[PDB]
């Protein structure tokens, strides 16, 4: 539901670089290129940004207390 | 052996006795399902 | 780091080292076998679960030497080749 | 050890929280009340009962 | 633990491999995953290696891939660009023993696939009975693993 | 003379069920073995007095 | 041995090893993966969690975030690690996103290197409060301990003949890859410092053709670390701790 | 009513007298272990601590199992239950841990956790043949799920894709000693449906051993080695190098495979690599003349 902090092949940190990375989808440029300016080069730390999808802000939204 | 619980939809406190209770819901607004609130007694849960 | 023998010949020794992997055992089976007097070097993984922590080492010499004066010159051969790797690392950058 | 369908899966990718899950589940207890006005209680029992 | 591809290849964990003894690539990739290459000519697999490549294609050029039916891209047009991207056409890579460090002598297939963690797992699976509640009919044990 | 196999697992069965229960053992043990143990080693030896009745 | 540094980035480090074998090359890599030691949050005590994330998947993202170690003060190339405990305290108020940077650590040098880690967002009327337990450990024990990453591959040499066609294309390729390429009069020689796969139409030409040697001892590393540690400091603390385990089984050897 | 309680698969005749459940079994999902024996079976820590054998008290096992009982149920290897002469069974918990310890004599039994070497019955459901329960022996591992030796696989007719087997463990020392002498895995891996081998190498066995033999398969000192090491051979000494390439020895394949050989082994026969009968009739002519063909003259036409 929230972006993993490191890539789960070799541990480099991606969730500091997630949001800019989807900032940057949103605005209509090629998330391969937003991935290389980004450091982001080794496919598996790729893989990791490109297939998280999103979804704490619908489980914000059920209260639990 | 009364306690505070919190509301399902309002969140609000409510206060109330489950040994002595005649009905359980929230006077605030209506809702008749309540949440336990977690005890403020510090927890230690391990990092993987 | 322990070393707990198994069996001893006259020119055998088989031995647990627990509380390593296998990183030192390979480059100590590998430093065995740049040595000439060494017939026989060799390590093992008897479980990667149970064990993965404990290899196992059979060192078979000729008979010049005692096979715990070839793995003590293996040992001292890794460590000076580490201090020369460490030694060209520093002036590498500085 | 992927022999006969098995999968070898790697350690730190376990431990960096791959495939990790959790699983839920539910109790339910009923404060039921029985004929003549006996009921349920809810309360921490007494240990010499 | 049950993992299961998308294409009927499922199986339990057999190992927990270290990082330092799993193999690595040339271009420095880990599999988070090895599976056995027996498995997939014997049940007529290519669906997988088809999403092997084009979950490396899609990974490496940041745009995903389709796998529709009948109108999904061609296989050819993903080991196109697979090697235009600077690699191996078939997916094949050269990997390097963890164990030993040597270079293996076969380039391993190593790609992107979908695996999916199943609910049967063994934590939920386990059962073990010494002596305990026997049926009041036959004086046998229960049935089940909650009782 | 042979010993079939149902016959040797229901002699070292016998012998094993002695032991539990007495019989002292015949030849030296190694200390912290099972009886099932000690009636195979018993069996090895060649050392065990159980025989077997055969129809004839 | 000879050491030439080929790429240096303030988180990684690609460089040349000459005079070294395959076994010693494998050893330091797996020194520097699963030996080095670096913080990480081993324990957490939780007061208030009223996010969506739970108390283990917070536990969990605090263990991932990478926590700048002081080498200076505790010796990491001891095979013994100093039970010093790092404590993070955290006390946030939504509706907002708690960073890395918000922890409050109880030691200036051992604080989380990236600032800009996001870990849970909280929604109105929710608050996180916690106590981080951070110690030493090593890679070989989990993850979070992990200094970075770190392979290597072998210094190969491709000599691709003149007579073989279109190895223009390849010299071409293999400028534009950032390799090292020399021309002569007969072939040109490719040096791969990086990755490099020949294309399906120069398959048939790799027997006779194309050739590859590997250069005897020398091998291409590639180590990146997550901000943990200097990445010049990774690779010697990884080779003191190869000289401490080579002291320590001599000491070993000796008394048996 | 009566009649529907005795007929059916549900009737007491079938589902409680012909089968029922039992005590001291468990169940769980097998995993693959290679470097265990035919002979043993991989039992998690938290099934042996849980399933007890119950050994009786003699003059010879006394210190062992005053031991199991001093470690406690909590504590591997210990121990469950203590059963007296006269036969009152006692839980053992943590307050009396050490008075039955110190009351512990001949002629008392105690249910001791599974320990290595211990005999259990292995079972996979459907049993189709004798040969679907085999007895094995206790490798005791801190992970969850059982594990099984690859070659006893094919006797199971099981893979491992989500797979449950069930353990038994005999109770008494007769049982014990059946199972032992009886339904031993290494007893049974001749199939009696066929007369052939059953317990048998699959897969990367196969896969692995065509690698290994094949023609042009050398393998250098430090790998012949390691492969010693890793299959457990009493190799003391190399045996002489094939050839030299650049400098150093190489062993060919067939030369480490046949150190698993016995000796005083010769046998012949063709595989299923079979396309070119006639170096194959060749070598059966060279061997139908000399019949003990110098191994120069095999290895020109082999
Ligand atoms: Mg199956
Ligand atoms: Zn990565
Ligand atoms: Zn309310």
């Excluded at chain 1, 997630?18 to 980004?38: N, Q, S, T």
């Excluded at chain 5, 491999?17 to 290519?46: A, F, K, Y």
């Excluded at chain 8, 459907?126 to 005791?140: G, Q, T």
Aim: aromatic share 8%.
């Amino acid at each position: 539901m929230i972006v993993p902090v490191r890539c789960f092949t070799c541990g480099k940190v991606l969730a500091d670089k997630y949001y800019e990375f989807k900032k940057r989808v949103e605005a209509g440029e090629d998330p391969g290129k937003v991935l290389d300016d980004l450091g982001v080069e080794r496919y598996c730390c790729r893989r990791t940004l490109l297939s998280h999808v999103e979804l704490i802000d619908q489980v914000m939204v059920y209260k639990v207390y | 052996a009364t306690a505070v619980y919190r509301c399902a939809k309002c969140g609000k406190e409510v206060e109330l006795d489950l040994a002595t209770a005649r009905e359980v819901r929230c006077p605030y607004c209506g809702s008749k399902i309540l949440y336990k609130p977690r005890p403020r007694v510090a927890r230690r849960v391990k990092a993987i | 780091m322990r070393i707990e023998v198994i069996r001893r010949e006259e020119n055998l020794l088989e031995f647990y080292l627990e509380g390593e992997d296998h990183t030192f055992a390979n480059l100590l089976t590998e430093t065995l076998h740049e040595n000439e007097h060494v017939t026989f070097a060799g390590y093992t993984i008897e479980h990667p679960i149970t064990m993965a922590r404990k290899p196992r080492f059979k060192v078979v010499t000729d008979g010049k030497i005692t096979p715990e004066k070839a793995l003590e010159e293996a040992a001292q051969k890794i460590f000076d080749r580490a201090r020369e790797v460490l030694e060209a690392w520093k002036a590498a950058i500085e | 050890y992927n022999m006969e369908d098995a999968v070898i899966i790697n350690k730190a990718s376990i431990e960096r929280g791959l495939a990790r899950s959790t699983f839920f589940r539910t109790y339910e207890a009923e404060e039921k009340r029985y004929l003549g006005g006996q009921k349920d209680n809810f309360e921490v029992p007494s240990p010499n009962i | 633990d049950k993992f299961a591809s998308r294409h009927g290849q499922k199986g339990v964990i057999g190992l927990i491999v270290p990082q330092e003894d799993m193999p690595w690539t040339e271009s420095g990739i880990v599999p988070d995953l090895i599976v056995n290459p027996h498995g997939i000519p014997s049940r007529m697999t290519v669906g997988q290696l088809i999403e092997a490549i084009g979950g490396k294609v899609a990974s490496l050029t940041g745009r995903r891939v389709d796998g529709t039916a009948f109108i999904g891209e061609p296989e050819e047009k993903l080991r196109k660009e697979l090697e235009e991207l600077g690699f191996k056409h078939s997916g094949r890579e050269i990997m390097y023993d963890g164990i030993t460090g040597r270079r293996l002598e076969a380039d391993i297939f190593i790609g992107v696939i979908y695996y999916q963690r199943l609910h049967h797992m063994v934590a939920d699976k386990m059962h073990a009975r010494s002596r305990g509640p026997v049926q009041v009919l036959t004086k046998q044990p229960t049935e089940g693993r909650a009782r | 003379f042979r010993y079939t196999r149902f016959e040797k697992a229901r002699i070292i069965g016998a012998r094993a069920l002695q032991i539990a229960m007495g019989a002292p053992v015949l030849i030296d043990v190694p200390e912290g073995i099972t009886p099932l143990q000690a009636a195979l080693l018993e069996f090895e030896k060649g050392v065990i007095p159980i025989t077997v009745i055969r129809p004839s | 041995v000879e050491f030439k540094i080929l790429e240096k980035r303030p988180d990684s480090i690609k460089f040349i090893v000459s005079g070294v074998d395959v076994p010693f090359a494998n050893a330091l890599r797996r020194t520097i993966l699963s030996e080095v030691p670096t913080f990480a949050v081993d324990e957490v005590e939780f007061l208030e969690n009223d996010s969506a994330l739970f108390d283990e998947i917070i536990a969990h993202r605090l263990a991932m975030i990478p926590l700048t170690t002081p080498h200076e003060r505790f010796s990491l190339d001891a095979l013994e690690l100093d039970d010093y405990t790092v404590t993070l305290s955290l006390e946030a108020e939504g509706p907002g996103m708690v960073y890395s940077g918000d922890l409050k650590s109880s030691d200036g040098d051992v604080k989380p290197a990236n600032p800009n880690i996001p870990i849970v967002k909280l929604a109105e009327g929710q608050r996180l409060t916690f106590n981080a337990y951070a110690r030493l450990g090593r890679g070989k024990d989990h993850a979070k301990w992990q200094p970075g990453f770190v392979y290597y591959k072998y210094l190969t040499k491709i000599h691709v003949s003149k007579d073989v066609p279109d190895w223009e294309e390849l010299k071409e390729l293999a400028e534009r890859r950032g390799l090292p390429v020399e021309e002569s009069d007969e072939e040109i020689v490719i040096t791969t410092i990086k990755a490099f796969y020949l294309p399906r139409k120069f398959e048939e030409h790799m027997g006779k053709g194309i050739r590859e040697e590997i250069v005897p001892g020398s091998f291409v590393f590639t180590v990146e670390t997550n901000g943990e540690l200097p990445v010049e400091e990774i690779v010697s603390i990884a080779l003191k701790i190869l000289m401490r385990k080579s002291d320590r089984f001599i000491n070993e050897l000796h008394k048996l | 009513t009566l009649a529907q309680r005795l007929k059916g698969k549900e009737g007491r005749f079938r589902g409680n007298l012909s089968g029922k459940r039992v005590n001291f079994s468990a169940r769980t999902v097998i995993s693959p272990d290679p470097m265990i024996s035919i002979n043993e079976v991989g039992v998690p820590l938290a099934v042996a601590m849980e399933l007890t054998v119950p050994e009786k008290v003699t003059e010879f096992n006394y210190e062992k199992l005053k031991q199991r009982v001093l470690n406690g149920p909590e504590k591997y290897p210990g121990a469950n239950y203590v059963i007296d002469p006269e036969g009152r069974r006692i839980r053992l918990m943590e307050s009396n841990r050490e008075l039955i310890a110190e009351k512990l004599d001949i002629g008392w039994t105690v249910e001791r956790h599974l320990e290595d070497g211990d005999v259990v019955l292995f079972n996979r459901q459907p049993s189709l043949h004798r040969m679907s329960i085999m007895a094995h022996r206790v490798r005791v591992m801190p992970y969850r799920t059982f594990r099984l030796n690859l070659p006893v696989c094919p006797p199971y007719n099981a893979d491992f894709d989500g797979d449950e087997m069930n353990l038994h463990v005999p109770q008494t020392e007769e049982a014990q000693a059946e199972a032992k002498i009886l339904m031993e895995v290494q007893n049974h891996i001749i199939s009696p449906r066929y007369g052939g081998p059953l317990i048998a190498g699959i897969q990367d066995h196969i896969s692995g051993g065509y690698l290994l033999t094949r023609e042009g398969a050398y393998f250098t000192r430090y790998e012949v080695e390691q492969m010693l090491m890793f299959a457990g051979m009493d190799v003391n000494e190399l045996p002489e190098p094939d050839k030299y390439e650049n400098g150093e020895p190489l062993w060919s394949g067939k030369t480490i495979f046949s150190l698993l050989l016995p000796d005083d082994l010769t046998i012949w026969y063709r595989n299923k690599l079979c396309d070119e009968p006639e170096r194959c009739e060749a070598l059966e002519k060279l061997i139908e003349e000399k019949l003990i063909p110098d191994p120069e003259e095999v290895r020109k036409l082999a």
